[PDB]
Amino acid sequence: GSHMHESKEWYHASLTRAQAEHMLMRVPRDGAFLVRKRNEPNSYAISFRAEGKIKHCRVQQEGQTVMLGNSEFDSLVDLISYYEKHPLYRKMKLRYPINE
C-alpha cells in the first residue's frame, strides 16, 4: 500500500474526469499526462494525450500491487516510471506530467 504517489507532481487527489480533460487542454501535446483518484475505492485513472486526443486508463489497487489491465506493478510510482519508458497507448509514452 505505497502512498509515495500522493506527493508526485503528476498525482491529483481531487480531480474529476472532466477537470482532468480540461487541464490537458492547456498545453496540448502528446505524452502529457496526470494521475487522479477515482470516486470508487482503490481505483485511479491515468488521463493523457495520445494521437492528438485525450484518453483515460483505469488502474486498480488490489493487495500489494496496482494493475493496469493485466500489467502488474508494485506501486503507482513504479507503474508511471514504466510507462515513461514503454508505450502506454500505441506508440505514446508518458512524458509531460501535468501539475499546476
Which residue shows C-alpha cell 493487495? 63
The Cα–Cα gap between 89 and 62 comes to: 23
**Measured in whole angstroms, how far is the alpha carbon of residue 18 from the centre of its chain?**
14
Length of the chain in terms of residues written:
100
**Exposure on the CB side of residue 51, measured as CA atoms within 13 A:** 7
Domain ranges of the chain: 1-100
Distances (CA, A) of 43 to 37, 74, 79, 91: 6, 15, 14, 25
Question: Is 5:81 a contact under the CB 8 Å cutoff?
Answer: no
Declared resolution, Å: 1.4
Question: What topology does CATH give the domain 1-100?
Answer: SHC Adaptor Protein (3.30.505)
Question: Is 47:21 a contact under the CB 8 Å cutoff?
Answer: yes
